[PDB]
Amino acid sequence: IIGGTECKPHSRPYMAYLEIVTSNGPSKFCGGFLIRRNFVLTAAHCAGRSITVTLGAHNITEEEDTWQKLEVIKQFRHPKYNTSTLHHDIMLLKLKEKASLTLAVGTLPFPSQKNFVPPGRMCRVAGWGRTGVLKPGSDTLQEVKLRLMDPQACSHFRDFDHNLQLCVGNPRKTKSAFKGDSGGPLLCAGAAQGIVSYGRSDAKPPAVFTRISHYQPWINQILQAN
Ligand SMILES: CN(C(=O)c1cc2ccccc2cc1C(=O)[C@@H](c1cccc2ccccc12)P(=O)(O)O)C1CCN(C(=O)c2ccc3ccccc3c2)CC1
Numbered sequence: 001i002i003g004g005t006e007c008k009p010h011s012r013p014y015m016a017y018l019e020i021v022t023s024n025g026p027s028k029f030c031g032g033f034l035i036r037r038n039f040v041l042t043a044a045h046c047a048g049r050s051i052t053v054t055l056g057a058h059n060i061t062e063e064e065d066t067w068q069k070l071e072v073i074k075q076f077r078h079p080k081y082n083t084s085t086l087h088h089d090i091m092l093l094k095l096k097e098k099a100s101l102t103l104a105v106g107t108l109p110f111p112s113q114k115n116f117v118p119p120g121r122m123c124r125v126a127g128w129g130r131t132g133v134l135k136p137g138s139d140t141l142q143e144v145k146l147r148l149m150d151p152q153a154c155s156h157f158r159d160f161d162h163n164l165q166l167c168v169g170n171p172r173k174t175k176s177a178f179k180g181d182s183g184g185p186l187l188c189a190g191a192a193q194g195i196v197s198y199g200r201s202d203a204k205p206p207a208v209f210t211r212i213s214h215y216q217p218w219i220n221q222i223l224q225a226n
Pocket residue numbers: 029030045046083084086177178179180181182196197198199200201203207208
């Protein structure tokens with residue numbers, strides 16, 4: 001998160017920290033959020049050989065009794081996820097066991113395909129991503145308020161599609177989601193509407209978020225079958 005503030009510890013109980021092991025190189029991390037006791041929603045580009053989810057955290061390098069760490073047993077990348085168009089950057093993760101719901105660990109619902117969030121309103125995103133182009137990922141969970149922009153604001157992003165993605169962050173400000181925040185949810189009025197997908201390597205807003213509403217049917221299918 002660029003230009004955000006540290007969250008009040010445990011104020012966003014649905015936040016999930018993902019530690020991903022790549023079939024080949026260094027490990028990496030992403031954000032995500034609990035939509036069911038045993039399911040976490042995140043970005044498809046965050047997939048890997050194996051993933052461990054940590055719930056109930058704030059300072060990810062400091063274990064707390066609120067922590068619930070669970071191994072992912074199944075990765076469900078959207079079938080149409082495309083690395084060229086970067087469309088459908090969404091994925092569901094099934095946890096080895098159901099997490100226990102506590103004040104520090106809770107679920108968040110996903111929106112209906114009929115509910116299309118239009119440009120103009122203010123939302124917020126949280127994450128453990130880098131706080132600058134040359135800064136490491138934040139130890140603590142950060143959050144920032146960002147403006148939902150007209151899709152035209154994201155025309156410089158190849159294949160940007162208003163029906164599938166959200167254009168987030170006023171370009172005349174430096175505040176923005178950034179590397180490491182991927183997979184993390186964008187909340188507008190307390191309801192999840194997007195998933196951090198990608199943006200400029202130089203961290204300049206706006207960034208691209210997956211429009212969650214568009215994938216409700218797909219999400220419900222997976223939940224039904226698992
Ligand atoms: C240098 N960058 C950034 O510093 C960056 C800027 C951002 C700005 C705003 C919001 C989110 C952002 C996320 C990132 C990343 O690098 C992500 C990340 C890491 C690795 C592969 C990823 C694949 C798809 C989406 C995010 C990915 P990360 O957050 O997972 O680590 C980004 C610039 C634009 N990108 C690409 O053209 C791109 C597309 C397909 C790819 C497929 C395989 C490998 C690399 C790839 C890179 C992505 C990296």
